[PDB]
């Protein structure tokens, strides 16, 4: 969080961290809010990739597919109902930007 961000590696843009706050309903945000928000996403992505890599490595593959992340997602006891299919991202979806 406080020290999970490091110089030299790519991070979230500053404006997108403020968008994450507005989805939560916050009205006023401090100027030193980007550092904890960038830290938490970089921690959560590091947690998700590390679980997904070992599922891929144990299956002797080289590409992280949807089955590897799904085994990674519920290994942390986090139920996920937004499983993508081949029809994902149609008109307005949960996967678009």
């Amino acid at each position: 969080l406080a020290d999970h961000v490091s110089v030299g590696e790519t991070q979230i843009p500053k404006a997108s961290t403020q968008h994450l706050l507005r989805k939560a309903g916050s009205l006023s945000a401090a100027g030193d809010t980007e550092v904890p928000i960038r830290g938490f996403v970089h921690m959560k992505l590091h947690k998700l990739v590390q679980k997904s890599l070992l599922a891929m490595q144990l299956a002797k593959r080289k590409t992280i597919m949807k089955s590897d992340v799904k085994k990674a997602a519920e290994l942390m006891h986090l139920p996920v109902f937004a499983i993508p299919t081949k029809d994902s991202g149609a008109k307005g979806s949960v996967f678009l930007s």
Binding site: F81, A82, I83, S88, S93
Partner: protein, 89 residues
């Protein structure tokens, strides 16, 4: 997957309301994970010296996951469905 089961109930309950394909996949994913949490509850409450899941184990396992009003309305609906299966087999 439970896609065709969910669509039939929507036709019975809301005849003028359809469902998106993306929304149907999320509902089916809820239905799959709902059966998984009940299945874990049925095994946990089952005694270690037993190797069969009876109908009574699923009854008590759903009562833990479903609190108060939902659990009370669940047990009446399960037993009515079971006794229909017992006399029509």
């Amino acid at each position: 997957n439970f896609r065709l089961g969910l669509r039939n109930m929507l036709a019975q309950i809301h005849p003028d309301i359809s469902v998106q394909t993306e929304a149907l996949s999320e509902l089916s994913n809820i239905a799959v994970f709902l059966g998984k949490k009940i299945s874990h509850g049925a095994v946990t409450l089952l005694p270690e010296g037993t190797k069969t899941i009876k109908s009574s184990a699923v009854l008590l396992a759903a009562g833990d996951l479903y609190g108060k009003d939902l659990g009370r309305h669940a047990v009446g609906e399960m037993t009515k469905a079971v006794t229909r299966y017992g006399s029509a087999k």
